[PDB]
Amino acid sequence: ILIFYKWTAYDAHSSRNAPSLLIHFINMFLFSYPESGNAMLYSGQKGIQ
Amino acid sequence: IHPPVSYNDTAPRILFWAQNFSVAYKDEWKDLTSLTFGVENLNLTGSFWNDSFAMLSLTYEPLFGATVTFKFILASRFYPVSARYWFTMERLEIHSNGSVAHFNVSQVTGPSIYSFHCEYVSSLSKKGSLLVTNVPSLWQMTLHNFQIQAFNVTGEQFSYASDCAGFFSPGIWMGLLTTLFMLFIFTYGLHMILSLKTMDRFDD
Amino acid sequence: TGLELLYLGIFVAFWACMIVVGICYTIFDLGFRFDVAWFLTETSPFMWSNLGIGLAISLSVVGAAWGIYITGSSIIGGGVKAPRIKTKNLVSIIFCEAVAIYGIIMAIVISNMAEPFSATDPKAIGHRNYHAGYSMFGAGLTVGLSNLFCGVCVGIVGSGAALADAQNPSLFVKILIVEIFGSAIGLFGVIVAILQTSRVKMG
Amino acid sequence: LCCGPKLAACGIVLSAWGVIMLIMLGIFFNVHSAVLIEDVPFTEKDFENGPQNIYNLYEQVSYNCFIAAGLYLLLGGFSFCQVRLN
Amino acid sequence: NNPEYSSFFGVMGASSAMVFSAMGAAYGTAKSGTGIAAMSVMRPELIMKSIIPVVMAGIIAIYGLVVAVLIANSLTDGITLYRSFLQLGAGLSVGLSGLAAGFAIGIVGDAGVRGTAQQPRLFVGMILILIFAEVLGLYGLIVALILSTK
Amino acid sequence: NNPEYSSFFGVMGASSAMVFSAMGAAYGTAKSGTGIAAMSVMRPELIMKSIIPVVMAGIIAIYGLVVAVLIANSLTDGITLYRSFLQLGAGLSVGLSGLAAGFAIGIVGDAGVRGTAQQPRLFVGMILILIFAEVLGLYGLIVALILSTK
Amino acid sequence: NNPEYSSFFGVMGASSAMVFSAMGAAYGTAKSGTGIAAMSVMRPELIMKSIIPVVMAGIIAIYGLVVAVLIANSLTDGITLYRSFLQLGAGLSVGLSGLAAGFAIGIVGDAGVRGTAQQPRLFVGMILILIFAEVLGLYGLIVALILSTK
Amino acid sequence: NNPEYSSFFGVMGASSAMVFSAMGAAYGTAKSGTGIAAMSVMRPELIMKSIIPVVMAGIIAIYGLVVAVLIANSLTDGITLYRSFLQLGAGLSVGLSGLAAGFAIGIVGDAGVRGTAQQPRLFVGMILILIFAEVLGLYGLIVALILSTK
Amino acid sequence: NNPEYSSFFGVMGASSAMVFSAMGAAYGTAKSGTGIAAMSVMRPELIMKSIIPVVMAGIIAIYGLVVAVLIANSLTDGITLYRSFLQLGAGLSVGLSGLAAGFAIGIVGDAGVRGTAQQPRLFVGMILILIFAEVLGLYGLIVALILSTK
Amino acid sequence: TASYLRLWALSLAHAQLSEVLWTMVIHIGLHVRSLAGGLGLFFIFAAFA
Amino acid sequence: PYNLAYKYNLEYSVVFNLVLWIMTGLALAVIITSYNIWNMDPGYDSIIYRMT
Ligand SMILES: CCCCCCCCCCCCCCCCCC(=O)OC[C@H](COP(=O)([O-])OCC[N+](C)(C)C)OC(=O)CCCCCCCCCCCCCCCCC
Ligand SMILES: CCCCCCCCCCCCCCCCCC(=O)OC[C@H](COP(=O)([O-])OCC[N+](C)(C)C)OC(=O)CCCCCCCCCCCCCCCCC
Ligand SMILES: CCCCCCCCCCCCCCCCCC(=O)OC[C@H](COP(=O)([O-])OCC[N+](C)(C)C)OC(=O)CCCCCCCCCCCCCCCCC
Ligand SMILES: CCCCCCCCCCCCCCCCCC(=O)OC[C@H](COP(=O)([O-])OCC[N+](C)(C)C)OC(=O)CCCCCCCCCCCCCCCCC
Ligand SMILES: CCCCCCCCCCCCCCCCCCCC(=O)O[C@H](COC(=O)CCCCCCCCCCCCCC)COP(=O)(O)OCCN
Ligand SMILES: CCCCCCCCCCCCCCCCCCCC(=O)O[C@H](COC(=O)CCCCCCCCCCCCCC)COP(=O)(O)OCCN
Ligand SMILES: CCCCCCCCCCCCCCCCCCCC(=O)O[C@H](COC(=O)CCCCCCCCCCCCCC)COP(=O)(O)OCCN
Ligand SMILES: CCCCCCCCCCCCCCCCCCCC(=O)O[C@H](COC(=O)CCCCCCCCCCCCCC)COP(=O)(O)OCCN
Ligand SMILES: CCCCCCCCCCCCCCCCCC(=O)OC[C@@H](O)COP(=O)(O)OCC[N+](C)(C)C
Ligand SMILES: *[C@@H]1O[C@H](CO)[C@@H](O[C@@H]2O[C@H](CO)[C@@H](O)[C@H](O)[C@H]2NC(C)=O)[C@H](O)[C@H]1NC(C)=O
Ligand SMILES: *[C@@H]1O[C@H](CO)[C@@H](O[C@@H]2O[C@H](CO)[C@@H](O)[C@H](O)[C@H]2NC(C)=O)[C@H](O)[C@H]1NC(C)=O
Ligand SMILES: *[C@@H]1O[C@H](CO)[C@@H](O[C@@H]2O[C@H](CO)[C@@H](O)[C@H](O)[C@H]2NC(C)=O)[C@H](O)[C@H]1NC(C)=O
Ligand SMILES: CC(C)CCC[C@@H](C)[C@H]1CC[C@H]2[C@@H]3CC=C4C[C@@H](O)CC[C@]4(C)[C@H]3CC[C@]12C
Ligand SMILES: CC(C)CCC[C@@H](C)[C@H]1CC[C@H]2[C@@H]3CC=C4C[C@@H](O)CC[C@]4(C)[C@H]3CC[C@]12C
């Protein structure tokens, strides 16, 4: 779902702050949601994950 | 052997020797060893010796149709990762008529208690290129066999002289490590190949 | 033991040289030349990072191949008199290859953190880039060596399991637990490598 | 020149493959397909005025491909004659 | 700007991708040929079927050649340290992966040629193990293709 | 700028290309010679037919000679370190790939010539395995040419 | 004005050419001599005829001596570093190629002289394999001459 | 002026010329003595005739001594670095060629005296092989003389 | 006014104190376990009585842990090079003395349990020898404490 | 989920091997100015096939 | 005089590494070759059992 959502959402203009799903999955497992680095893919990501 | 240039402040403070000292403006070279080492009237004015900052200013009056001044600016300070003061020739500064040309000095560093030595502390690429710039400059320098001590100078003698010449350089180190990994891999492979054995008998 | 003699001679000579070199540098007051700072710093972070990625992939593949041959020799030897080994004990090979799959995954994750500097002066390269190179190298070492050891261990256990199955069918199902335990080590190495390169940023 | 039917079959299948693929490659080169630009033997001078030089080189490579296709057609005919002999 | 020695690591990466893959494929070919020779004295009809491990060792060599050619065609005079060391890493990956995959293919094939000689059913099992052994070197090649084009 | 020592790597590339290829070819020739000598005590008629592995080892040596002379005919005084590294890499690739191919040809040819005294039908299998071993040296030569003539 | 240390690699090239070639010739002579002595106890008439591999090893040593004399006559006080590296590379190539060729000659000559005691028809095969082995030293000499006289 | 450590390499050349020639001669003499003992256990009449390998090893030692004395007499305090390198290369050449010749002579003499204990006709072949082994030390001597006199 | 690499030696002292003591304890436990397993097949009743060597090796490991924790708590950011060297010396002393004691305990425990299977009276002698072996590690601990609490 | 990456691994390998085969075999026969190359393409394409 | 430094050559690293590793390789090759010849099979195995 994350892969498809990123494909449908992020485009060239938002390229700069496009998150990496690898890092986001690692952080999902590690509970390591940081306040720095790539931003959240969508609102409520911390809670849902 | 011409004597080193010795800037004294109550005692020899900055000693500077250079087997050859040549400078070029618009590719017009000129030797300055005879006008620098041994001359009793050297225009050393403008020099300065802090406790932790030294500036050796050698000025030549008729050079290239103007009074030119080469200022070697070194600084020594306490580095926390050791208890030892280290000194580095921070830069070089050539003042011609109402102008300044700056040269970075790359690898002139070493313990304060030890002078520094290097063959070809020069701006030419063929000769080490320890004097460097990113802004193209009309000046070039070559201090063949350059030895300088600005701090912890006692008497007339250069202390022991840490020098630029090393057993290894960064490129040699990278190459040696890469070749070492490849030698390990090739040794593993050659071992496994040499371990190949052929059958001594065949089925009836 | 000619080759081992050569290796032992090289090792002894190198470390005797190192001992005497260190004694000389310390005693002659030339320690300031032994600049480990200058070594680690001038040595480009790219060397460390790319050696790390290469090791992460290569050592994982080395362990996978080691285990695969260790267990396939036994599988094929046992199957000459009981061919069911070939059909059942392919799981050991599957584990040995999952080791290499972890290797490539971590190679990708490490390589995703690479980026040029456009700087050569250490102060310009900065802590971020130097630590990035060092941590990518360390993560590559961790994943590659843990995967190597896990693959060799699973291969040994799988050869044992195949030999035991060649004599009694109901033993492989119980001996696969050892394979699972040996497999856990590669996962541990992957987790540690990911933790190491979590906050790694070259640029 | 009698020869093995296996060799004749291999020759005829290779001839058919070569004819079809080389004819298609020639047609694409002649159409000037940009995908095959790397295969054109052009030089630095060819980028001077316009694309006509690169088009001419495309056509030359297409002619090479058609010549190869014709040679493979002759080879396939030889293989078919050998098959008929066998 | 860039050090005059920057191209050394890329050149050595191409050389490694070729050499270590060649050594691995040579070990595979040698072990498989030893097995085939030992087997053939009694089962001549299995030589062609049993020549597969040699072919897979050749495939390892082909992966090595491919990555070496890529790096050798990517080398340039102004090659930065970044590209040079990326190519060094790709070369190490391909070379060592092909080395290990060739070792595994050689050992497994030497075992399985003799095994299939005795037990015909073991042929498919030997092939199954060998494809894994080969895709180890393939994984090396994949990482090399990622790196040398990072 | 084109240091005095830049030519060392090219010179060592030529030397390595000759040396390691010669070592591989010598290994192949020597092992195949021992195999032929053991075989011919009982099958004299195959001495001349079984010299093929020696010929393939010699071909490995010929690849080495080709690359070594090719490098030696490109060593100008002011050779850039980049070009010298290219020549060193080409020499290493050709020489060590030929070394591995020579190991493979020696092992395979010795085993094949010794087993063909038993099974005449193993000759074609041995020839195919030797071709697969020789293509390793040929890949080394291809990469060496791509590099050196870059 | 040239470095004072430039002649080191030239003298090392000469010494290596005469040393590794001498080692290879010594191995060939020793192994072929052991084989000849073992044969002679039963077939004395084959001593003179079987001395051939010793002659091949001697020719390898002669290649080494020739290249060493070439370098030892090309040395000069102001020898440039490029020429000195060329001499070192030629010496390495000739010496180590002669080393491998001499090892191959020794192994092949021992095996073949032992076999010819049992199968007289193996003499020509031995001669052909020894020629193939000596051609490796010949290649080393050719590359050494190219590099040295370059 | 010249560096103060220049004479070191020439001194090492002399010392090596003596040392490695002595080592080769010692190996030859040891193996020849073992063979002479094994032979004399049954053929005392050949005790004196079988000392020839020992004489040849001694001649190799004489080559080493000659080159060492020549270098010693050529040494001087202000020996130019180039001359010192020449002397070192000459010394290494003579010493290691003599070591190889000593190996060859030792193995050949051992096997050959053992054989001549049983086949008298192998004596002449033994002399011929010993000559082909001593010519290696002679070649080393020639190269060392060229480098030293130069 | 102290180097920031000063703590490296003390940290290595603690790490060595634990590591080498653990290696010695592992050798002792492994050898004694092999001995106990070998002797338990025939004489099961002696397992608990014979578990002594494992206990002694564990005590060695505890010595190592004690010194390691002492060093770790003595560590500090501005640890003078003198105290850092003292802790390195204590760590090496305890670790390697415990390593030697672990080797001694392994050998003596293996031999003692295997013999006590055969000779019941040997138990007390084995205990005495194990006590001496443990005393070695105790000496190491004493020296390490003296060095680490100066 | 990791091992299903063998799909991408083998696909990329097949694509790259096909690309290198093309560029090393029939690029030779196609990158020839002279019309005589049409004859060379014969053998070059036999090798390619 | 003036305790001037020893006029080390700027390429010291390059020349030192070249010489060190070249001579190490040559020495290792010589050692390996001499070892192979010394430990070479005596070759009179057909005579060992006759003399002994
Ligand atoms: C045998 C197997 C094959 C070999 C494989 C192993 C190879 C090992 C690699 C060797 C390289 C070692 C680094 C060299 C640089 C460090 C040298 C050093 O500390 O001295 C210079 C350092 C620093 O010198 P410096 O900084 O004053 O010099 C000025 C700086 N340069 C030269 C760069 C311009 O200290 C000295 O000055 C010491 C002078 C005496 C030399 C002492 C060297 C120690 C070794 C000598 C004995 C040999 C040991 C082996 C014993 C026998 C075998 C077991
Ligand atoms: C497929 C793998 C096969 C097995 C592995 C074998 C690979 C061998 C590759 C060649 C050796 C390379 C070593 C590391 C140096 C790499 C080059 C580099 O980065 O240098 C640039 C550097 C750049 O210089 P720099 O800028 O770093 O230096 C600072 C500035 N100066 C120099 C003025 C002080 O320059 C050099 O070329 C350094 C010299 C390196 C010399 C190393 C000696 C190697 C000896 C070869 C082996 C022995 C041969 C004889 C064998 C006998 C028979 C067996
Ligand atoms: C059993 C083995 C035999 C023992 C010897 C082993 C081989 C060691 C020799 C290696 C060759 C190096 C010789 C000296 C080269 C010139 C170096 C030089 O210029 O020196 C300047 C160096 C460094 O410069 P410096 O200290 O002279 O200059 C002053 C520097 N400041 C101001 C910073 C203090 O110092 C010397 O003068 C050293 C002179 C003696 C060096 C002798 C070799 C040292 C190693 C000896 C062996 C060590 C183990 C002893 C115990 C063994 C027991 C088994
Ligand atoms: C064989 C297994 C490995 C162990 C032996 C080898 C270990 C080391 C091998 C790597 C190369 C050599 C490393 C040291 C390099 C020199 C570092 C240097 O000069 O800085 C020193 C540093 C700093 O020197 P410094 O001159 O800066 O002094 C400090 C001065 N202030 C504070 C003003 C800045 O201090 C030390 O002395 C640290 C101790 C380590 C150096 C000595 C190495 C010992 C090598 C083993 C021999 C031990 C002797 C006893 C033998 C019996 C052993 C049981
Ligand atoms: C013939 C075959 C092909 C060629 C051979 C290639 C393979 C062999 C090469 C491997 C390396 C061998 C030599 C190692 C030397 C160790 C340190 C020497 C001490 C020394 O004097 O070094 C100082 C610098 O070192 C430092 O700053 C210390 C850094 C030490 C790091 C050592 C890491 C690698 C070796 C040990 C670990 C091995 C495992 C892999 C990591 C010199 O000072 P300078 O005067 O030049 O300084 C200039 C500015 N200050
Ligand atoms: C002990 C005294 C003091 C020694 C100090 C000096 C340094 C050590 C040098 C060796 C000293 C002992 C002599 C050993 C000679 C070499 C090893 C044995 C002979 C040998 O190499 O031949 C065979 C391998 O083939 C070969 O000849 C292949 C070898 C060439 C490969 C070169 C690549 C390695 C480069 C080194 C870097 C890697 C470092 C790894 C740690 C091995 O024969 P066998 O054992 O099968 O048969 C049994 C008899 N030989
Ligand atoms: C009984 C057996 C022997 C046991 C004794 C221990 C032997 C350890 C061998 C390593 C060498 C000894 C350690 C102390 C010497 C460190 C170098 C000091 C020389 C020095 O002044 O360097 C500073 C930088 O060093 C630094 O800041 C470097 C800090 C790190 C030093 C320790 C690293 C050793 C390698 C550890 C690798 C472990 C691998 C684990 C798998 C200067 O720098 P500055 O900031 O003043 O620069 C000013 C430039 N203008
Ligand atoms: C132009 C040519 C190139 C020039 C450069 C080279 C200059 C000369 C140096 C290279 C070596 C020349 C001398 C040849 C050594 C002969 C090797 C014989 C090997 C051998 O058979 O000995 C084995 C032991 O190996 C061993 O013990 C290994 C040999 C000993 C190592 C030699 C090096 C000594 C250490 C150097 C220290 C100084 C370094 C600098 C500070 C014994 O065989 P086995 O084990 O079966 O025995 C069982 C029966 N006893
Ligand atoms: C044995 C059995 C037989 C085997 C059969 C195998 C058949 C293989 C035949 C093909 C092989 C070669 C592949 C080359 C493919 C590239 C050709 C290509 O791109 O085509 C299309 C181009 O012509 C047109 O595209 P354009 O001119 O760039 O743009 C214009 C396109 N608009 C107008 C649509 C926008
Ligand atoms: C220092 O070096 C300069 C050159 O940098 C030497 O003077 C040059 O000598 C050469 C060779 O005769 C001439 O081509 C140049 O024209 C001379 N000078 C210049 C400015 O180019 C000078 O002799 C050296 N001085 C010493 C060693 O004291
Ligand atoms: C001695 O050197 C000083 C310092 O250069 C000379 O005085 C002035 O120095 C500044 C700073 O470098 C220059 O900008 C001025 O041009 C110098 N003035 C003159 C008149 O040259 C001073 O002149 C020198 N003294 C002698 C006697 O030559
Ligand atoms: C020489 O030393 C004095 C102190 O004795 C330095 O004074 C410092 O100057 C630097 C650079 O301007 C300032 O950052 C410091 O705040 C000053 N004060 C102290 C107490 O260090 C003086 O700068 C030095 N000389 C020169 C020319 O910089
Ligand atoms: C004794 C015989 C069998 C040796 C092998 C044949 C010789 C004569 C031939 C075959 C191919 C030839 C090489 C082919 C191409 C070139 C490139 C050219 O720029 C220099 C010469 C060089 C490098 C040739 C040298 C001689 C060579 C090696
Ligand atoms: C072992 C004995 C019988 C061999 C004697 C052969 C004679 C003719 C040979 C052997 C070595 C030769 C010498 C080798 C090198 C030199 C140095 C050169 O600058 C002048 C010639 C001279 C001096 C040679 C003269 C001829 C010579 C003396």
PDB file of all heavy atoms in Angstrom, chain F residues 15-28:
ATOM      1  N   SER F  15      54.877  -7.136 -17.798  1.00  0.00           N
ATOM      2  CA  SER F  15      55.561  -8.250 -17.151  1.00  0.00           C
ATOM      3  C   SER F  15      54.566  -9.248 -16.581  1.00  0.00           C
ATOM      4  O   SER F  15      54.744 -10.457 -16.731  1.00  0.00           O
ATOM      5  CB  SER F  15      56.489  -7.733 -16.055  1.00  0.00           C
ATOM      6  OG  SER F  15      57.557  -6.987 -16.607  1.00  0.00           O
ATOM      7  N   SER F  16      53.508  -8.764 -15.931  1.00  0.00           N
ATOM      8  CA  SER F  16      52.497  -9.649 -15.370  1.00  0.00           C
ATOM      9  C   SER F  16      51.741 -10.393 -16.461  1.00  0.00           C
ATOM     10  O   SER F  16      51.491 -11.597 -16.336  1.00  0.00           O
ATOM     11  CB  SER F  16      51.533  -8.841 -14.507  1.00  0.00           C
ATOM     12  OG  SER F  16      50.495  -9.654 -14.002  1.00  0.00           O
ATOM     13  N   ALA F  17      51.388  -9.703 -17.546  1.00  0.00           N
ATOM     14  CA  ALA F  17      50.674 -10.355 -18.635  1.00  0.00           C
ATOM     15  C   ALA F  17      51.480 -11.513 -19.191  1.00  0.00           C
ATOM     16  O   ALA F  17      50.933 -12.589 -19.453  1.00  0.00           O
ATOM     17  CB  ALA F  17      50.368  -9.350 -19.742  1.00  0.00           C
ATOM     18  N   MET F  18      52.783 -11.314 -19.384  1.00  0.00           N
ATOM     19  CA  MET F  18      53.612 -12.420 -19.854  1.00  0.00           C
ATOM     20  C   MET F  18      53.765 -13.487 -18.776  1.00  0.00           C
ATOM     21  O   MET F  18      53.586 -14.679 -19.041  1.00  0.00           O
ATOM     22  CB  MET F  18      54.980 -11.910 -20.299  1.00  0.00           C
ATOM     23  CG  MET F  18      55.754 -12.892 -21.165  1.00  0.00           C
ATOM     24  SD  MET F  18      54.862 -13.435 -22.634  1.00  0.00           S
ATOM     25  CE  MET F  18      54.572 -15.159 -22.247  1.00  0.00           C
ATOM     26  N   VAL F  19      54.048 -13.069 -17.542  1.00  0.00           N
ATOM     27  CA  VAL F  19      54.486 -14.002 -16.512  1.00  0.00           C
ATOM     28  C   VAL F  19      53.348 -14.918 -16.093  1.00  0.00           C
ATOM     29  O   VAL F  19      53.500 -16.142 -16.085  1.00  0.00           O
ATOM     30  CB  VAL F  19      55.049 -13.232 -15.308  1.00  0.00           C
ATOM     31  CG1 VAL F  19      55.115 -14.126 -14.087  1.00  0.00           C
ATOM     32  CG2 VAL F  19      56.415 -12.693 -15.636  1.00  0.00           C
ATOM     33  N   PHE F  20      52.204 -14.350 -15.717  1.00  0.00           N
ATOM     34  CA  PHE F  20      51.140 -15.181 -15.168  1.00  0.00           C
ATOM     35  C   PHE F  20      50.508 -16.044 -16.248  1.00  0.00           C
ATOM     36  O   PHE F  20      50.126 -17.193 -15.990  1.00  0.00           O
ATOM     37  CB  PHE F  20      50.096 -14.308 -14.482  1.00  0.00           C
ATOM     38  CG  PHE F  20      50.621 -13.568 -13.285  1.00  0.00           C
ATOM     39  CD1 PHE F  20      50.170 -12.296 -12.992  1.00  0.00           C
ATOM     40  CD2 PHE F  20      51.558 -14.143 -12.450  1.00  0.00           C
ATOM     41  CE1 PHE F  20      50.648 -11.615 -11.896  1.00  0.00           C
ATOM     42  CE2 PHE F  20      52.038 -13.463 -11.354  1.00  0.00           C
ATOM     43  CZ  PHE F  20      51.581 -12.199 -11.078  1.00  0.00           C
ATOM     44  N   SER F  21      50.413 -15.526 -17.471  1.00  0.00           N
ATOM     45  CA  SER F  21      49.970 -16.361 -18.578  1.00  0.00           C
ATOM     46  C   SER F  21      50.942 -17.506 -18.815  1.00  0.00           C
ATOM     47  O   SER F  21      50.523 -18.640 -19.066  1.00  0.00           O
ATOM     48  CB  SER F  21      49.813 -15.525 -19.846  1.00  0.00           C
ATOM     49  OG  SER F  21      49.232 -14.266 -19.567  1.00  0.00           O
ATOM     50  N   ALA F  22      52.248 -17.232 -18.740  1.00  0.00           N
ATOM     51  CA  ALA F  22      53.230 -18.291 -18.923  1.00  0.00           C
ATOM     52  C   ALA F  22      53.136 -19.326 -17.814  1.00  0.00           C
ATOM     53  O   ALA F  22      53.267 -20.523 -18.068  1.00  0.00           O
ATOM     54  CB  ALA F  22      54.637 -17.697 -18.982  1.00  0.00           C
ATOM     55  N   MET F  23      52.908 -18.887 -16.575  1.00  0.00           N
ATOM     56  CA  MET F  23      52.749 -19.832 -15.474  1.00  0.00           C
ATOM     57  C   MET F  23      51.513 -20.701 -15.663  1.00  0.00           C
ATOM     58  O   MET F  23      51.570 -21.919 -15.464  1.00  0.00           O
ATOM     59  CB  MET F  23      52.695 -19.089 -14.138  1.00  0.00           C
ATOM     60  CG  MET F  23      53.940 -18.254 -13.850  1.00  0.00           C
ATOM     61  SD  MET F  23      53.991 -17.386 -12.271  1.00  0.00           S
ATOM     62  CE  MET F  23      52.543 -18.025 -11.436  1.00  0.00           C
ATOM     63  N   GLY F  24      50.391 -20.104 -16.063  1.00  0.00           N
ATOM     64  CA  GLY F  24      49.199 -20.903 -16.306  1.00  0.00           C
ATOM     65  C   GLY F  24      49.387 -21.893 -17.439  1.00  0.00           C
ATOM     66  O   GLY F  24      49.016 -23.068 -17.332  1.00  0.00           O
ATOM     67  N   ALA F  25      49.969 -21.432 -18.547  1.00  0.00           N
ATOM     68  CA  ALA F  25      50.206 -22.317 -19.679  1.00  0.00           C
ATOM     69  C   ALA F  25      51.188 -23.419 -19.313  1.00  0.00           C
ATOM     70  O   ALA F  25      51.027 -24.566 -19.736  1.00  0.00           O
ATOM     71  CB  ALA F  25      50.724 -21.517 -20.869  1.00  0.00           C
ATOM     72  N   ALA F  26      52.220 -23.087 -18.537  1.00  0.00           N
ATOM     73  CA  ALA F  26      53.181 -24.089 -18.104  1.00  0.00           C
ATOM     74  C   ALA F  26      52.521 -25.123 -17.208  1.00  0.00           C
ATOM     75  O   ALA F  26      52.818 -26.314 -17.310  1.00  0.00           O
ATOM     76  CB  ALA F  26      54.344 -23.416 -17.379  1.00  0.00           C
ATOM     77  N   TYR F  27      51.627 -24.688 -16.320  1.00  0.00           N
ATOM     78  CA  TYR F  27      50.919 -25.638 -15.469  1.00  0.00           C
ATOM     79  C   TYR F  27      50.054 -26.571 -16.303  1.00  0.00           C
ATOM     80  O   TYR F  27      50.063 -27.794 -16.103  1.00  0.00           O
ATOM     81  CB  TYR F  27      50.071 -24.888 -14.444  1.00  0.00           C
ATOM     82  CG  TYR F  27      49.396 -25.790 -13.441  1.00  0.00           C
ATOM     83  CD1 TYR F  27      49.920 -25.960 -12.170  1.00  0.00           C
ATOM     84  CD2 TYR F  27      48.236 -26.474 -13.766  1.00  0.00           C
ATOM     85  CE1 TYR F  27      49.308 -26.785 -11.254  1.00  0.00           C
ATOM     86  CE2 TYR F  27      47.618 -27.300 -12.857  1.00  0.00           C
ATOM     87  CZ  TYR F  27      48.157 -27.452 -11.601  1.00  0.00           C
ATOM     88  OH  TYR F  27      47.543 -28.275 -10.688  1.00  0.00           O
ATOM     89  N   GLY F  28      49.298 -26.014 -17.247  1.00  0.00           N
ATOM     90  CA  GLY F  28      48.493 -26.857 -18.113  1.00  0.00           C
ATOM     91  C   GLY F  28      49.341 -27.843 -18.894  1.00  0.00           C
ATOM     92  O   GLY F  28      49.047 -29.040 -18.939  1.00  0.00           O
TER      93      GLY F  28
END
